[PDB]
Amino acid sequence: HHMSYTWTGALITPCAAEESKLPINALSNSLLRHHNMVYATTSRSAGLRQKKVTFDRLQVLDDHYRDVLKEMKAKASTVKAKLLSVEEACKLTPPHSAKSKFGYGAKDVRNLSSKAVNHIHSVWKDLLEDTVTPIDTTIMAKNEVFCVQPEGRKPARLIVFPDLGVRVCEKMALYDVVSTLPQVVMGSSYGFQYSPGQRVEFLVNTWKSKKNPMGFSYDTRCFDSTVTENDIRVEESIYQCCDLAPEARQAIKSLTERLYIGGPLTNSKGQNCGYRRCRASGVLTTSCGNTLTCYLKASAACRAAKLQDCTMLVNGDDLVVICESAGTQEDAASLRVFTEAMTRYSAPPGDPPQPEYDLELITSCSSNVSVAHDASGKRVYYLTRDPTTPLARAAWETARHTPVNSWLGNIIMYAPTLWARMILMTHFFSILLAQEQLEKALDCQIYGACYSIEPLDLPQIIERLHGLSAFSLHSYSPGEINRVASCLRKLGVPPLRVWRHRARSVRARLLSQGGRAATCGKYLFNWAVKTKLKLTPIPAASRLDLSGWFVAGYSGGDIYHS
Ligand SMILES: O=C(O)CCC(=O)Nc1ccc(Br)cn1
């Protein structure tokens, strides 16, 4: 038996009171009236999740798999990675990261307190000295907000993470590796190197490079749970191809053996819940490991399937392939073979993949390409998504402060979209104005890494990522308009015409404030007025240090970039 998990029967327990019901305040109804459609996951559904993610994995590795791996190792051998100092690793820790079980917290780490630093040193020495003893981890149910899907509720996802002292050691050994290796190994196929605009450009340029394009997304069922001991050792063998300090080689070996491959699961109350033999969701290498393993299995599966001129785009477990169509009959056959190959490699599908011949209909990283027009009438492709989950989360954040402000990450990632501009920007600027909180930095997440961002810097941040056209887009596609309008009806959100009316008020209110607030009024809400102002490059935008923003994925990796 090669079971993903074994369980003792102890429960996955909360740390505090969990709310599942949408909190309601005086602001809630201005955004969303169908309150019973919005919920948060809690530890109450963790048992259901346990059942889904617990299964036997079989793996049959053929020559396509070994050929691809050999090519990947060749590329990896060109990477030179450095050790981070303790201070550098400490400064990457989020201020509100989970405290150590050993008497210090994230703030002590960030401040380089003698107690934190001495313990980190001792964890580091232990990693060098011992390469066998499984490292303890905490298992928790994530509290995440969704809209009910009648087609009702998702069980909580699990997060599995080692102690704070270990997490700092991971950064020291592996931050530079996980930040640099994936793009070297995968080239343009590595999704996390792209802003949303660069993602769209890569997908558009790829689609146009095929004589008769076909594309598909591949949805692996419970990817983390499909990741086998073999997979994690193969990831380590790729890491070791790098030019590394010998102390780094040893830490990486030790972390692989003791943490990455598996280990005991401890609940919040300190009881043993069981044992993991698959990917831990809360380690530094979760994103890089998943991306490498997905790309390996998929590249080999493409060879088994004989897909012609295939181009992959991989972001963790999220995979899209664009290739040369062999007619629609051979295309469907090819996907069945690809799927069979993936399954043999232990990556079976959730929903079976389907050939797509319209780029705008391929969803990947929950997103799709769509088309609008810029100020000169030119067709412009941009990244959008179904706004259901963004709006459900915004409703929650309307009434509750949360560690991660999804609305702000959403504005940043989806600035050019109809729904971020009309609803998210309007709603939240209105709240910030009222509470005089425009100048207060808020934490958000981009590709899993944490950023502290002042809302007043949004115009500059958006110009830098999306360009000035994000403030000028118009004539959105009927399909996009209709999906947005349909989502509002579903959630009981007021129609766009209401938001336009509200935005004129928000705009005027921002302009009245002068300074950076007026700039927000001017740039972000130019769409709301008939007498449209000329938007010109913002001098402040070029001064913004946006390095590290779209370099790598860090989901579960405990990374803070501010
Ligand atoms: O195509 C036009 O100019 C009329 C409809 C249109 O695109 N209006 C619009 C533009 C941007 C935003 Br945001 C909302 N509505």
Side-chain angles (χ1 to χ4, degrees), residues 93-99 106-107 110 443:
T93 300
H96 298 107
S97 186
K99 60 180 165 64
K107 315 269 204 179
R110 293 192 56 75
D443 293 334

Side-chain angles (χ1 to χ4, degrees), residues 418 421-422 473-476 500 527:
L418 180 62
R421 297 175 79 192
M422 291 194 82
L473 290 195
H474 66 93
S475 279
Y476 292 91
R500 189 178 308 272
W527 61 267

Side-chain angles (χ1 to χ4, degrees), residues 135-148 150 152-156:
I135 287 169
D136 184 46
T137 62
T138 301
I139 184 166
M140 301 290 281
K142 289 198 260 203
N143 306 130
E144 299 183 288
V145 172
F146 302 94
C147 175
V148 301
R153 301 191 173 192
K154 292 159 140 71

Side-chain angles (χ1 to χ4, degrees), residues 53-86 88-100 102-148 150 152-210 212-220 222-305 307 309-319:
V53 298
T54 305
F55 50 86
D56 198 38
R57 294 83 49 78
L58 284 326
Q59 213 158 25
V60 184
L61 306 179
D62 65 350
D63 289 289
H64 293 310
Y65 177 93
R66 280 176 311 273
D67 290 344
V68 171
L69 176 51
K70 182 157 208 214
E71 291 166 32
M72 290 172 77
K73 293 188 185 172
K75 291 176 172 76
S77 71
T78 68
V79 176
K80 182 172 157 72
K82 68 170 171 175
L83 225 31
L84 262 43
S85 71
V86 182
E88 285 161 348
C90 286
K91 298 306 185 165
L92 286 164
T93 300
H96 298 107
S97 186
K99 60 180 165 64
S100 186
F102 305 96
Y104 61 89
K107 315 269 204 179
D108 300 306
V109 161
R110 293 192 56 75
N111 291 334
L112 314 165
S113 80
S114 86
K115 191 184 204 293
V117 173
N118 298 331
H119 184 246
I120 296 156
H121 278 116
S122 74
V123 175
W124 186 258
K125 204 183 203 308
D126 181 77
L127 286 173
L128 300 181
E129 290 177 359
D130 175 337
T131 60
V132 291
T133 313
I135 287 169
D136 184 46
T137 62
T138 301
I139 184 166
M140 301 290 281
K142 289 198 260 203
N143 306 130
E144 299 183 288
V145 172
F146 302 94
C147 175
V148 301
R153 301 191 173 192
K154 292 159 140 71
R157 291 198 308 182
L158 277 20
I159 182 85
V160 171
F161 60 99
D163 188 73
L164 178 59
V166 170
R167 302 199 302 274
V168 181
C169 287
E170 288 186 84
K171 296 162 168 66
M172 282 186 284
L174 284 157
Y175 185 78
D176 197 34
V177 167
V178 299
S179 291
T180 57
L181 180 171
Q183 190 278 325
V184 173
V185 172
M186 296 168 274
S188 58
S189 292
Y190 184 53
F192 294 117
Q193 73 192 285
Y194 300 129
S195 67
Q198 295 169 334
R199 180 183 181 89
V200 161
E201 182 185 38
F202 177 72
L203 286 158
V204 169
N205 290 345
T206 300
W207 191 261
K208 295 207 284 176
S209 75
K210 318 304 179 188
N212 290 292
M214 180 273 281
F216 65 97
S217 49
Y218 189 84
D219 169 44
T220 298
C222 305
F223 188 95
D224 282 5
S225 301
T226 70
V227 171
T228 65
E229 176 177 342
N230 167 83
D231 293 335
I232 293 153
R233 288 182 184 286
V234 164
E235 288 157 17
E236 193 256 11
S237 75
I238 296 161
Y239 305 150
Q240 294 290 356
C241 288
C242 294
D243 184 351
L244 296 162
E247 197 183 14
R249 294 191 180 284
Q250 181 77 351
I252 292 168
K253 185 188 177 197
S254 189
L255 290 164
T256 297
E257 293 288 358
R258 300 179 59 191
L259 179 67
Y260 302 150
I261 284 170
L265 302 159
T266 303
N267 71 15
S268 66
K269 289 175 188 189
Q271 311 169 291
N272 185 233
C273 284
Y275 207 88
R276 165 189 54 90
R277 292 177 207 86
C278 65
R279 172 86 65 217
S281 51
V283 293
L284 180 55
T285 51
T286 300
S287 179
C288 182
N290 281 354
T291 303
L292 288 169
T293 292
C294 187
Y295 172 91
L296 171 52
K297 284 170 189 194
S299 293
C302 284
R303 299 189 180 192
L307 296 185
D309 187 12
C310 59
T311 299
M312 313 215 308
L313 182 60
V314 192
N315 290 73
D317 68 345
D318 201 283
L319 169 63

Side-chain angles (χ1 to χ4, degrees), residues 192 194-196 404-405 408-410 412-413 443-453 461 465 546 548-555 559 561:
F192 294 117
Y194 300 129
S195 67
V404 169
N405 299 281
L408 180 53
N410 279 323
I412 292 165
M413 297 304 278
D443 293 334
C444 64
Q445 286 200 319
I446 301 152
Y447 293 163
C450 187
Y451 292 88
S452 177
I453 283 160
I461 289 166
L465 306 195
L546 268 33
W549 272 51
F550 304 100
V551 167
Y554 301 100
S555 180
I559 299 295
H561 278 146

